[PDB]
Design an enzyme around this catalytic site. Structure first.
Site, PDB file in Angstrom:
ATOM      1  NE  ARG A 258       9.434 -26.472  -2.081  1.00 45.64           N
ATOM      2  CZ  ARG A 258       9.996 -27.668  -1.930  1.00 45.64           C
ATOM      3  NH1 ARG A 258      11.089 -27.979  -2.612  1.00 45.64           N
ATOM      4  NH2 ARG A 258       9.461 -28.552  -1.099  1.00 45.64           N
TER       5      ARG A 258
ATOM      6  CG  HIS B 239      -1.428  18.782 -12.723  1.00 47.86           C
ATOM      7  ND1 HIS B 239      -2.623  19.443 -12.527  1.00 47.86           N
ATOM      8  CD2 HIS B 239      -1.248  18.721 -14.066  1.00 47.86           C
ATOM      9  CE1 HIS B 239      -3.136  19.767 -13.698  1.00 47.86           C
ATOM     10  NE2 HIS B 239      -2.324  19.341 -14.647  1.00 47.86           N
ATOM     11  CD  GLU B 240       2.314  18.060 -15.727  1.00 45.21           C
ATOM     12  OE1 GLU B 240       1.813  19.196 -15.576  1.00 45.21           O
ATOM     13  OE2 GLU B 240       2.004  17.291 -16.674  1.00 45.21           O
TER      14      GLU B 240
ATOM     15  CG  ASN C 249       6.910   6.757   4.264  1.00 45.17           C
ATOM     16  OD1 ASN C 249       6.771   5.625   4.729  1.00 45.17           O
ATOM     17  ND2 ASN C 249       7.995   7.129   3.594  1.00 45.17           N
TER      18      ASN C 249
HETATM   19 CA   LIG Z   1       4.602 -22.168  -4.551  1.00 45.62          CA
HETATM   20 CA   LIG Z   2       8.775   4.971   6.208  1.00 43.70          CA
HETATM   21 ZN   LIG Z   3      -2.231  19.459 -16.830  1.00 44.59          ZN
END
Ligand SMILES: [Ca+2]
Ligand SMILES: [Ca+2]
Ligand SMILES: [Zn+2]
Ligand SMILES: *[C@@H]1O[C@H](CO)[C@@H](O[C@@H]2O[C@H](CO)[C@@H](O)[C@H](O)[C@H]2NC(C)=O)[C@H](O)[C@H]1NC(C)=O
Ligand SMILES: *[C@@H]1O[C@H](CO)[C@@H](O)[C@H](O)[C@H]1NC(C)=O
Ligand SMILES: [Ca+2]
Ligand SMILES: [Ca+2]
Ligand SMILES: [Zn+2]
Lengths: 423, 424
Positions: free
Chosen positions: B300, B151-152, B224
């Protein structure tokens, strides 16, 4: 059931709770003692109505915050901590503050998903009336439910299983933490707890605390008169007391009292009226002073022959050697023959009459029936005719209870067999 | 209403939030003064945050963790406002000088005043002063604390609280404005909307940079969608993995596969040597070809010295740094490079006008190296009356200095306070 059981179940219950907050709690609430107490009050304010549906009124009689250092070693192991907490209560807390039950509100996280732990049926016990609760969630009513849960176990309740229900939501005694937990106790808890009180009748939950011993802020409508209140009959919707203004917890205009065997239609009963009638042979029917709203429980003068002339009234009760024996060594026990009391003439270790300071005094020839009590653990076999109940922790335990009949028209006073001061 | 090309490109790039987590002293005590139990708790939380953000085209990667087990580095207090402010400031002055990262969150066992359980700067993502949040280890249930943290971070990523009309289904959403326990792991449409707009409008660059596998300090988690040390590939759960080169159960390359991803990987096998994998993006760039022995495509460029931007300067490591551009990057649109005379102040070796710092002293420019010192610009303001205007920072005296490889003379470019000859 019996006359004493059902009579007990009826009596209004009270749990004089002592709460302790550990050093993590102090830190958790910004080192603000007021903030920690306010948290405990909030928690009790939820526990109380929860226990009203169980005929119990939880009252906060003590509060202590280990803001300097923990008095014990609060640890991740709920088991170790509980053990440590109880003992500390037994040896340190109780010695300086009487209360029926203590709960440790700690800010530490217990190993596992558990948020608390407590001694099953340990209520009132000087060594086991304790539990520990983790202040596991910002929402205080959930912490309240957890504490009510540990208090439940103390009150003989077991986790809810299969069939047990209380509605569409989990009950206090549910086995795990569920944020949908309700404030209700299931039928099972209702029962197990009923049975539990029937089997042990813990005496300490019958004593109503003085309105001045309750340290939590007054809550109008929690069915208990607290400092700042004249009466409490619940909310205005449920209040049935016509003498009480439920909205303010004050007596309505013209009322002198609201409850008591000495109150009548909001007015004191006339000086002379009888309020409580004698319950037994040793109790005496009481009267009202016309001035107070209460009825003082007066007893039949001590030395009154009782229990078929097997004892004498001593402050409302009838102390009998026989009862003492069966109480110390269980059913079937009987009082030892008289010769056995001669052992009190030694003033040795177990056999003596009284204690000056800590020094034991021997029983003079005429006072042997007032020192240590001698019983016969009744197995018709038991060869040894003399047997005593002794305790290192408290040497009084096992001595002949004061006021015990030690001869015709005679009862023990302070380790002495003296004549009843009655006719 | 329309959408530019760079916007679309930005939106499509994979996003990563290189997260630094700090646990406070109370956390340390709360979990029995056991460092392992505290780290495990934080890993648990991150293991929940990651799947929450994958639904937002973001991979949250724990590149750092610190447990204030002896003493707190700031005074963590019950007021979330103070704490946040002290935390962001400590992140800026202390942590950012020790480990690069995109966002930091403080996980405290303290109770914040009121019903709140966290606070964070709205849209502060990547900001060296505001990319921070603080969160209360408010529940024994760690996935709820994880939600509080998402949430934050959510606020940092430009999302606001869900209005009563916002939904993500039955349960309440991550950005629900009130601490609750029925809390779900999904972002409401309003959040998704506000997030997109936030991205389009600010295009925060730091979340485009993928962290190295060795930068991740959290135990590897197979499934994950991020290849961590000890893994060769990761396509999510077995029952949902569609990458045929990977064994979604062991996060190991399938027998017969040389790779699973890369500009130089094709159908689980290395592309043929010499096969082009990246076209040149500009004059200072050179097309790149595979090696047949790797899935990666080393990028490169042209050799340092080749003309560019119409003889403006000379290619430096793939770019064409020219004063004109630098003057605009520092003072905004309209800014122009100053008349040659202005650069004369570099000859004083004074406080702002020099060519370079020898030891810690300020070596002045030599008449020849006058354009490799402090860059002198001047804005197009009609009311402006000054020919030479310098950019300066007490913090970094180097800042506002002419960039390396910038054309100072004809066939010469700045290398070190000296207008060296291009061909070198
Ligand atoms: Ca390149
Ligand atoms: Ca993983
Ligand atoms: Zn909040
Ligand atoms: C520190 O805390 C950790 C908890 O994370 C303890 O380690 C766990 O110990 C239990 C023992 O039954 C194992 O089942 C877990 O797998 C362990 N967790 C991990 C991931 O290590 C550890 O015992 C604690 N250390 C001390 C000194 O008490
Ligand atoms: C301490 O806590 C109380 C109750 O939460 C609050 O009213 C009081 O302002 C707090 N003291 C300060 C200033 O932190
Ligand atoms: Ca009250
Ligand atoms: Ca009486
Ligand atoms: Zn339990």
């Amino acid at each position: 059931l019996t006359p004493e059981q059902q009579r007990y179940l009826n009596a209004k219950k009270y749990v004089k709770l002592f709460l302790v907050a550990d050093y993590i709690m102090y830190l958790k609430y910004g080192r603000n003692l007021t903030a920690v107490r306010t948290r405990m009050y909030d928690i009790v304010n939820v526990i109380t109505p929860i226990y009203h549906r169980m005929n119990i009124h939880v009252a906060l009689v003590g509060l202590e915050i280990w803001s300097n250092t923990d008095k014990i070693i609060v640890q991740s192991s709920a088991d170790v901590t509980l053990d440590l907490f109880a003992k500390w209560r037994a040896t340190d807390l109780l010695s300086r503050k009487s209360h029926d039950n203590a709960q440790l509100l700690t800010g530490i996280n217990f190993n596992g998903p558990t948020a608390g732990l407590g001694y099953l049926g340990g209520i009132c016990n000087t060594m086991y009336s304790a539990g520990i609760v983790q202040d596991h969630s910002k929402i205080h009513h959930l912490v309240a439910i957890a504490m009510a849960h540990e208090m439940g176990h103390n009150l003989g309740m077991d986790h809810d299983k299969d069939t047990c229900t209380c509605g569409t939501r989990p009950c206090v005694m549910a086995g795990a933490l569920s944020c949908e937990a309700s404030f209700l106790f299931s039928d099972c808890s209702q029962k197990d707890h009923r049975e539990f009180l029937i089997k042990n009748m813990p005496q300490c939950i019958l004593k109503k605390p003085l309105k001045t011993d309750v340290v939590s802020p007054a809550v109008c409508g929690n069915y208990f008169v607290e400092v700042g209140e004249e009466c409490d009959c619940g909310s205005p919707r449920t209040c049935r007391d016509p003498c009480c203004d439920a909205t303010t917890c004050k007596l309505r205009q013209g009322a002198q009292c609201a409850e008591g065997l000495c109150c009548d239609q909001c007015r004191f009963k006339g000086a002379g009226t009888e309020c409580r009638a004698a319950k037994d042979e040793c109790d005496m029917a009481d009267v009202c002073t016309g001035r107070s709203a209460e009825c003082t429980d007066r007893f039949q003068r001590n030395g009154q022959p009782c229990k078929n002339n097997n004892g004498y009234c001593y402050n409302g009760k009838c102390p009998i050697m026989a009862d003492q024996c069966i109480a110390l060594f269980g059913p079937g026990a009987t009082v030892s023959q008289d010769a056995c009391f001669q052992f009190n003439r030694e003033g040795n270790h177990y056999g003596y009459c009284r204690k000056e300071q800590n020094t034991k005094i021997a029983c003079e020839p005429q006072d042997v029936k007032c020192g240590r009590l001698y019983c016969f653990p009744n197995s018709p076999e038991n060869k040894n005719p003399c047997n005593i109940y002794y305790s290192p922790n408290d040497e009084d335990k096992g001595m002949v209870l004061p006021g015990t009949k030690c001869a015709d028209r005679k009862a023990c006073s302070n380790g002495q067999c003296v004549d009843v001061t009655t006719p």
